[PDB]
Every structure is written in structure tokens, then in C-alpha cells.
Scaffold this active site. Sequence first.
Site, PDB file in Angstrom:
ATOM      1  CG  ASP A   1      -0.385 131.978  45.089  1.00 11.38           C
ATOM      2  OD1 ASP A   1      -0.614 131.030  44.304  1.00 11.38           O
ATOM      3  OD2 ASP A   1       0.663 132.661  45.060  1.00 11.38           O
TER       4      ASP A   1
ATOM      5  CG  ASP B   1       3.521 131.900  45.326  1.00 10.98           C
ATOM      6  OD1 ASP B   1       2.573 131.148  45.004  1.00 10.98           O
ATOM      7  OD2 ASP B   1       3.541 133.133  45.089  1.00 10.98           O
TER       8      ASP B   1
ATOM      9  CD  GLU C   1       9.872 130.975  44.062  1.00 12.33           C
ATOM     10  OE1 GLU C   1      11.092 131.231  43.965  1.00 12.33           O
ATOM     11  OE2 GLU C   1       8.988 131.746  43.637  1.00 12.33           O
TER      12      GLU C   1
ATOM     13  CE1 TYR D   1       7.995 134.224  37.206  1.00 11.57           C
ATOM     14  CE2 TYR D   1       6.108 134.495  35.762  1.00 11.57           C
ATOM     15  CZ  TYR D   1       6.637 134.370  37.029  1.00 11.57           C
ATOM     16  OH  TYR D   1       5.800 134.397  38.118  1.00 11.57           O
TER      17      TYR D   1
HETATM   18  C1  4QU Z   1      13.233 143.563  46.929  1.00  8.37           C
HETATM   19  C2  4QU Z   1      12.666 142.625  47.993  1.00  8.37           C
HETATM   20  C3  4QU Z   1      12.621 143.020  49.366  1.00  8.37           C
HETATM   21  C4  4QU Z   1      12.084 142.135  50.363  1.00  8.37           C
HETATM   22  C5  4QU Z   1      11.610 140.888  49.967  1.00  8.37           C
HETATM   23  N1  4QU Z   1      11.648 140.486  48.617  1.00  8.37           N
HETATM   24  C6  4QU Z   1      11.174 139.226  48.209  1.00  8.37           C
HETATM   25  O1  4QU Z   1      10.642 138.334  49.149  1.00  8.37           O
HETATM   26  C7  4QU Z   1      11.235 138.860  46.802  1.00  8.37           C
HETATM   27  C8  4QU Z   1      10.788 137.643  46.301  1.00  8.37           C
HETATM   28  C9  4QU Z   1      10.873 137.367  44.950  1.00  8.37           C
HETATM   29  C10 4QU Z   1      10.423 136.107  44.350  1.00  8.37           C
HETATM   30  O2  4QU Z   1       9.864 135.096  45.135  1.00  8.37           O
HETATM   31  N2  4QU Z   1      10.538 135.919  42.990  1.00  8.37           N
HETATM   32  C11 4QU Z   1      10.117 134.670  42.381  1.00  8.37           C
HETATM   33  C12 4QU Z   1       8.614 134.591  42.120  1.00  8.37           C
HETATM   34  C13 4QU Z   1       8.085 134.857  40.875  1.00  8.37           C
HETATM   35  C14 4QU Z   1       6.718 134.755  40.672  1.00  8.37           C
HETATM   36  C15 4QU Z   1       5.875 134.387  41.720  1.00  8.37           C
HETATM   37  N3  4QU Z   1       6.396 134.125  42.915  1.00  8.37           N
HETATM   38  C16 4QU Z   1       7.705 134.226  43.096  1.00  8.37           C
HETATM   39  C17 4QU Z   1      11.127 136.965  42.188  1.00  8.37           C
HETATM   40  N4  4QU Z   1      11.552 138.158  42.750  1.00  8.37           N
HETATM   41  C18 4QU Z   1      11.421 138.342  44.126  1.00  8.37           C
HETATM   42  N5  4QU Z   1      11.838 139.488  44.617  1.00  8.37           N
HETATM   43  C19 4QU Z   1      11.760 139.765  45.911  1.00  8.37           C
HETATM   44  N6  4QU Z   1      12.226 140.991  46.307  1.00  8.37           N
HETATM   45  C20 4QU Z   1      12.186 141.381  47.643  1.00  8.37           C
END
Ligand code: 4QU
EC number: 3.2.1.14
Length: 538
Positions: free
Chosen positions: A288, A290, A292, A367
Amino acid sequence: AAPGKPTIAWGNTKFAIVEVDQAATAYNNLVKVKNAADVSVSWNLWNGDTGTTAKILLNGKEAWSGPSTGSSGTANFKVNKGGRYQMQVALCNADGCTASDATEIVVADTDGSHLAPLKEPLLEKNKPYKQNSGKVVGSYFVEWGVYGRNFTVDKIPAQNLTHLLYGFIPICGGNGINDSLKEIEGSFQALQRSCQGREDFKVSIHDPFAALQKAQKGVTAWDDPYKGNFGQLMALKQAHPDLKILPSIGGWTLSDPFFFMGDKVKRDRFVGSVKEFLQTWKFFDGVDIDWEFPGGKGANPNLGSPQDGETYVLLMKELRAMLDQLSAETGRKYELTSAISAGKDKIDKVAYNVAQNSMDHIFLMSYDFYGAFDLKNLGHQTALNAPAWKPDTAYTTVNGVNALLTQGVKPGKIVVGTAMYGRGWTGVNGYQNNIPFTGTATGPVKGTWENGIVDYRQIASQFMSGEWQYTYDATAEAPYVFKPSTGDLITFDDARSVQAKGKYVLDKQLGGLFSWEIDADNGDILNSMNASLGNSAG
Ligand SMILES: Cc1cccn2c(=O)c3cc4c(=O)n(Cc5cccnc5)cnc4nc3nc12
């Protein structure tokens, strides 16, 4: 006149075709792919004739034989197929063979063939559903959720999913390549440690402890070759062989390397590393992507180019060609998916009508339309339609779906996103006609783990009583709660808004539903996802 019955010596009984070095922090040293496991067995004979030939049998089939020359012996041999084997030592002469009692040995492989099925009961409010609608029901499991969130693979309601996405697999790279990671304490340094000695633009594992070594249910024995998230996902695949487990590459903070893949040297290296990753970790069912986002406007304000749309289409084409070759080598079906922005402004940066020919599913991120990142313009963060007070709202689920359909994307490719969390503001004020969304906020709402975001579990647990007003907006198809004394306003999905999305998916013949993130649900959301798409209870 047959030989005495030998006794298998005490010793290690667990071996691995893919070995994990237990004292290494770099991915290149952590993972050692071998063609076969190196197995060793010893025996003693406490009574009788030692025979003239000694054999090691695995489920009755000889894996090693040699002359029996004394009361004790050792055999070293290779086993090229994972599993749990009933191992025996047999001493043989012209008058017969005498086999030991069986000792179970483990020959580990990354398809989980050595692992007992991880078949766990449903927790919280999750109810059992059969996957007989033919629709996608997916959700994201996050690697870091095993810490503060204490949400592990054994807690996933796996029978209620067709797709489980693992966020996130990183792409190696230091300064200028993964700068977005520097905003998370220790995270950039963690990736550089994992990627030591490894070429930039190859995939790696961001947190190898969580992924491979943390003790978890079913993989707690010190000599278990695979522990952590990957070990449990292997055992989950044994319980649910039809579940599609996909590694998600990218996300908000790990997407920077994609912006360099207009260079085919880098793109080829990346695609080749994904192939190697899937050959190494056999429990994954595809990939997958992703990113962004193509064109920028993600975490990094300095990245984004008009060539990103072409790069995206080329990347999907080349990933598909790689997966088709992998499918021919293994006989397995592999999936290629991508999570994409639902904003028309970003959707039109890419020719999804072309890229769809390479992809199984498009995960439309319907979302995060609104949130504490904007305190001036408030709205429903994951609504199906525009609200009555602003019918021209740009960011709605329908507007994203319609944008894809307008390009020529087949509806069956499109998987609609649902939120297992709310976004929220505090100090909302200056609104009209009892619609808090027409006002402005002074900051983010107090969050479960980070400001401005609230687990759905906590919304239902804490914010649907007391002073909290509750409103289901039937025009937009979106719930929200509001505490007027403090101005706290949370926009989220509930069972009814998910119901509307599922009915919409069936009506428009879309692909299904998926959610971010599985740890935040109490069961209500996934239950409604399944029920609204027509899966039968059971
Ligand atoms: C707490 C934490 C620690 C380390 C690494 N982290 C991340 O790499 C994160 C990435 C995303 C993120 O990409 N999205 C968007 C999204 C939505 C639907 C599908 N794909 C992506 C949303 N919240 C995220 N929180 C993240 N939190 C952490």
C-alpha cells in the site's frame, strides 16, 4: 537384535530460515535470509546396541543419516521448509530400526508456518461478522500503538476485516530525504540507526523492537525466532488465511522520499527493495502506497512538483510489474493499493483513471477535512455531504468520489474512508443559529494522545454525557458533540454516519469501506462498517 532406543539430548529446538540477530539495530544486520534453517540434534543411547546407522527423521522422513559410531551422536543438517516437526532419532542395523520418542522442533519462516494460529476472542463491543458481501472492509494498525495505546495484534478483530494495513514502513534516507521525521522526537535518529549501511530509497523497519522483538501473546518464549508485531501478524495469518495484510509505505511523516522518485534510478531501487521486503516477510500480501501527497502540501512545505502525477503513475505501473513477477514466482495473488487525498484539488494532480489499471484498490481518505490545524474555518471532518449552512463546502466524501469518477476511475476501485476518531477545537465562539461550525476556535480540543484528536472510544465513553450536546446532522450525515461552557467541539464518525457511507457505497457500487485507526474504535465503528456493507452477522 535391533538397536537400543536412543534418547534425544536436551538442547535448542527452535531454528529459523530467516534469522533475526538479537544484538543488532541496523536492518541489514538484523535480518538474515537463508535458503534453509541450520538444524542440530544430539542423542544418547543408555541401553543396548548402538546400531550401525543413525538417522534424523522429521515426520518420519529422513533429514540426515550417518554411521552410528558411539553411544552419543550429533547431526547438523538443513531444513528448507517452515513448520513444527515431530523429530526423531533412529538407530538402525540389519535387524531393524529403533526410533526415539518424538521431540517437536520449530523451523521458523516468515509465512508463520511454524506458529500456532492467533485466534483471539472479540473484545469490547466488537460483534462477529462474516466477510460475504464481497466488499472491502479495511483498517490501519499502527506500529507504535503497542506502547502508550497498548493495542497489540492480538486485539485486532481480525475476522471482521478483509484488509489490515500496517502503518508504516519507512524509506531509508537522511538529511533532505526524511526531514519531516525531525518533527517527532527521536524519530529521524531511529530511522538513521535502522538504515545504517543501507542505501537511501530502500525500505526498512522504523521500530525493529516493536516489529520483531517485543514479547507479545503467542510469541513470548525467549527463543521464538519472531516476536513483536510481525510475529503476531504471521500467527494471525495462520488463523485468517484470507485476510489481506498490506505494508503501508509513507504516511504524513514518511512520505518525503517519494518526491525524489522522478529519478528512475531511485524509483527502481525502491521497487526492488519492496520486492525483496515481500520475499523476506512472506505474511504480507502486497503493498500500500500512502504518498502524502503528489504535488506537495503534506508535512514538508519544501517538497512537491508538477511532475509528481507522472511519477505516481509510473511508480504504480512498475510496482504492479514487480508484483506480477512475484506472483508468478510464488503462485500467490498480490495487491497494490494506495491511500489518497479526498480533496479534489489534490486528486486532480494525478491521472487516477490511468493509475487504476495498476491498482486493486484506492483508499480514499475521506476524513481530516477539518480540524485544529485551521481555527478559523470549521466543519465536519469526515462527512458524506455538505451541511445545510454551507452547501458549497469543498471537502466532502461525495466531492472526492465524484472527482475520481469524473477522471474515469471505475467505482469498484474506490474504498471510502471512515474515521475511528474525532477532531476538535476548544473555545469555539461567535457562531450563529446554534451551529457551532459557523464560529471560530481559539485552539485544539484536549486529545486522547495528542491535541486536537480524540479516540472514538473516548468520545463514546466520556463526551456523550454531562454538558455535552449531541447532534446528528442528517444533511451532511455527520455527528458532533459540543460543550458550550468551554466551546469544545468534536467532529467524528458514529454508527449512523458509517451506515450512511456503507449505503452510499452499495448504492454507487463502490469498493467498500476502510478506517483509521483500528486501536481507537470500541467496536461500534467496525460493527457498522460490516453491517452497512451487508456482511451477515456470525
Ligand atoms: C504517534 C506517531 C509516532 C510515530 C510515527 N507516527 C506516524 O508516522 C503517523 C502518521 C500518521 C498519518 O500518516 N496520518 C494520515 C493517514 C491517514 C490514513 C492513512 N494513511 C495516513 C494520520 N495520523 C498519523 N499519525 C502518526 N503518528 C505517529
